[PDB]
Design an enzyme around this catalytic site. Structure first.
Site, PDB file in Angstrom:
ATOM      1  N   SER A  42       0.782  -1.198   0.000  1.00  0.00           N
ATOM      2  CA  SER A  42       0.000   0.000   0.000  1.00  0.00           C
ATOM      3  C   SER A  42       0.844   1.293   0.000  1.00  0.00           C
ATOM      4  O   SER A  42       0.273   2.324  -0.091  1.00  0.00           O
ATOM      5  CB  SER A  42      -1.107   0.034   1.083  1.00  0.00           C
ATOM      6  OG  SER A  42      -2.019  -1.020   1.107  1.00  0.00           O
ATOM      7  N   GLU A 142      -4.358  -7.316  -6.212  1.00  0.00           N
ATOM      8  CA  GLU A 142      -3.310  -8.034  -6.958  1.00  0.00           C
ATOM      9  C   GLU A 142      -1.880  -7.580  -6.625  1.00  0.00           C
ATOM     10  O   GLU A 142      -0.968  -8.407  -6.526  1.00  0.00           O
ATOM     11  CB  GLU A 142      -3.551  -7.943  -8.473  1.00  0.00           C
ATOM     12  CG  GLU A 142      -4.673  -8.838  -9.010  1.00  0.00           C
ATOM     13  CD  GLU A 142      -6.091  -8.328  -8.688  1.00  0.00           C
ATOM     14  OE1 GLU A 142      -6.295  -7.098  -8.498  1.00  0.00           O
ATOM     15  OE2 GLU A 142      -7.015  -9.178  -8.631  1.00  0.00           O
ATOM     16  N   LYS A 208       3.373   6.448   5.619  1.00  0.00           N
ATOM     17  CA  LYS A 208       2.387   5.602   4.916  1.00  0.00           C
ATOM     18  C   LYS A 208       2.914   4.175   4.961  1.00  0.00           C
ATOM     19  O   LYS A 208       4.062   3.924   4.588  1.00  0.00           O
ATOM     20  CB  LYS A 208       2.200   6.058   3.463  1.00  0.00           C
ATOM     21  CG  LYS A 208       1.351   5.075   2.596  1.00  0.00           C
ATOM     22  CD  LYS A 208      -0.144   5.359   2.867  1.00  0.00           C
ATOM     23  CE  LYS A 208      -1.006   4.168   2.529  1.00  0.00           C
ATOM     24  NZ  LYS A 208      -0.865   3.075   3.612  1.00  0.00           N
ATOM     25  N   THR A 209       2.075   3.255   5.429  1.00  0.00           N
ATOM     26  CA  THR A 209       2.457   1.858   5.648  1.00  0.00           C
ATOM     27  C   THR A 209       2.049   0.992   4.441  1.00  0.00           C
ATOM     28  O   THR A 209       1.302   1.442   3.556  1.00  0.00           O
ATOM     29  CB  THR A 209       1.736   1.308   6.893  1.00  0.00           C
ATOM     30  OG1 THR A 209       0.335   1.657   6.831  1.00  0.00           O
ATOM     31  CG2 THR A 209       2.347   1.935   8.188  1.00  0.00           C
ATOM     32  N   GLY A 210       2.560  -0.235   4.403  1.00  0.00           N
ATOM     33  CA  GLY A 210       2.047  -1.256   3.503  1.00  0.00           C
ATOM     34  C   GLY A 210       2.204  -2.622   4.134  1.00  0.00           C
ATOM     35  O   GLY A 210       3.126  -2.849   4.931  1.00  0.00           O
TER      36      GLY A 210
HETATM   37  C1  LIG Z   1      -2.025  -2.275   1.534  1.00  0.00           C
HETATM   38  O1  LIG Z   1      -0.659  -2.560   1.943  1.00  0.00           O
HETATM   39  C2  LIG Z   1      -3.099  -2.873   2.082  1.00  0.00           C
HETATM   40  N1  LIG Z   1      -2.708  -4.253   2.353  1.00  0.00           N
HETATM   41  C3  LIG Z   1      -3.610  -5.199   2.150  1.00  0.00           C
HETATM   42  O2  LIG Z   1      -4.762  -4.968   1.752  1.00  0.00           O
HETATM   43  C4  LIG Z   1      -3.151  -6.628   2.396  1.00  0.00           C
HETATM   44  C5  LIG Z   1      -2.940  -7.145   3.666  1.00  0.00           C
HETATM   45  O3  LIG Z   1      -3.168  -6.342   4.741  1.00  0.00           O
HETATM   46  C6  LIG Z   1      -3.807  -7.026   5.859  1.00  0.00           C
HETATM   47  C7  LIG Z   1      -2.528  -8.477   3.797  1.00  0.00           C
HETATM   48  C8  LIG Z   1      -2.315  -9.268   2.665  1.00  0.00           C
HETATM   49  C9  LIG Z   1      -2.523  -8.732   1.396  1.00  0.00           C
HETATM   50  C10 LIG Z   1      -2.947  -7.407   1.264  1.00  0.00           C
HETATM   51  O4  LIG Z   1      -3.159  -6.815   0.036  1.00  0.00           O
HETATM   52  C11 LIG Z   1      -4.094  -7.531  -0.824  1.00  0.00           C
HETATM   53  C12 LIG Z   1      -3.627  -1.988   3.227  1.00  0.00           C
HETATM   54  N2  LIG Z   1      -2.545  -1.239   3.904  1.00  0.00           N
HETATM   55  C13 LIG Z   1      -2.071  -2.019   5.064  1.00  0.00           C
HETATM   56  C14 LIG Z   1      -1.064  -1.134   5.791  1.00  0.00           C
HETATM   57  O5  LIG Z   1      -1.159   0.082   5.589  1.00  0.00           O
HETATM   58  O6  LIG Z   1      -0.217  -1.678   6.522  1.00  0.00           O
HETATM   59  C15 LIG Z   1      -3.341  -2.376   5.906  1.00  0.00           C
HETATM   60  C16 LIG Z   1      -3.852  -1.185   6.737  1.00  0.00           C
HETATM   61  C17 LIG Z   1      -3.113  -3.572   6.820  1.00  0.00           C
HETATM   62  S1  LIG Z   1      -4.530  -2.800   4.575  1.00  0.00           S
END
Ligand SMILES: *C(=O)[C@@H](NC(=O)c1c(OC)cccc1OC)[C@@H]1N[C@@H](C(=O)O)C(C)(C)S1
Length: 265
Positions: A42, A142, A208-210
């Site tokens: 993200s 994706e 900003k995290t991911g």
């Molecule tokens: C982007 O990094 C988002 N990540 C996801 O939607 C995500 C997971 O997060 C639980 C786990 C496995 C795959 C995906 O992407 C399909 C969002 N950003 C993170 C972040 O900022 O750390 C969140 C808030 C956990 S969701």
């Protein structure tokens, strides 16, 4: 020695860790695996919001965007609540940065427009900032799913730190748009246990995290010392060794940030 400490963390968390802090007035760059590719996850949403701000007049923030059930395909804490009314571009930027709302990011990519649902124009925006390394190829969900080592939807700690430096500290955006981006990252709600946890309370932190599969956990920040000296901090990690369902480990980023904070204090 920093590199020894980072290597110790890699062993502790069965992880691969990448760190970059750009050189400043009195410090050389801090770099550990800084030119290795890691998934964006993200983290791309920060430069995405900058692209959308740059592309349009400010009154554009007030444009209402509507969306439906089939647009909700990823973790989207805000967009789910407003599906019956739509959301303005300003609300979508807010949600994409502060809640890492996946639907908001997808809609912002579509707003940028062009091939690949906006991914090509997003990449074009990075190229205009001199970033010849990063690439976005897919939208959410994706982009968080490429196998370890795959180059799709990747950046490097070096490249993304230099991008964030130009956006927040440099002149990539006009001051009014720069301030909007800075403020949203300042008010981020998802970053309390990452770079923020590693810096003392009297340091200002915006970020900003991911997070992704294969134990992926990133955080990109700009921090300011208690005397207003800024540093850009990019920390990226994965844990391929536990396969697709490897748990992301926030503590690894907190500890890497503590190590950087120790050198910068
Ligand atoms: C982007 O990094 C988002 N990540 C996801 O939607 C995500 C997971 O997060 C639980 C786990 C496995 C795959 C995906 O992407 C399909 C969002 N950003 C993170 C972040 O900022 O750390 C969140 C808030 C956990 S969701």
């Amino acid at each position: 020695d920093l590199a020894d400490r980072f290597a110790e963390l890699e062993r502790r968390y069965d992880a691969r860790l990448g760190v970059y802090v750009p050189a400043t007035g009195t410090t050389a760059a801090i770099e550990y695996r800084a030119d290795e590719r890691f998934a964006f996850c993200s983290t791309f949403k920060a430069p995405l919001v900058a692209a959308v701000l740059h592309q349009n007049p400010l009154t554009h923030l007030d444009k209402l965007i509507t969306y439906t059930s089939d647009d909700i395909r990823s973790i989207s804490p805000v967009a789910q609540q407003h599906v019956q009314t739509g959301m303005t571009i300003g609300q979508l930027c807010d949600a994409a940065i502060r809640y890492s709302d996946g639907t908001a990011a997808n809609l912002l990519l579509a707003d940028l427009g062009g091939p690949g649902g906006g991914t090509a124009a997003f990449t074009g925006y990075l190229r205009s900032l001199g970033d010849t390394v990063s690439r976005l190829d897919a939208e959410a969900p994706e982009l968080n799913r490429d196998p370890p080592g795959d180059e799709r939807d990747t950046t490097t700690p070096h490249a993304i730190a230099l991008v964030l430096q130009q956006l927040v500290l440099g002149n990539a955006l006009p001051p009014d748009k720069r301030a909007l981006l800075t403020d949203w990252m300042a008010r981020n709600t998802t970053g309390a246990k990452r770079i923020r946890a590693g810096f003392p309370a009297d340091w200002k932190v915006i970020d900003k995290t991911g997070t992704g599969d294969y134990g992926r956990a990133n955080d990109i920040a700009v921090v300011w010392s208690p005397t207003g000296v800024p540093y850009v901090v990019a920390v990226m990690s994965d844990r391929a060794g536990g396969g697709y369902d490897a748990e992301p480990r926030e503590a690894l980023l907190a500890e890497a940030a503590t190590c950087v904070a120790g050198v910068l204090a």
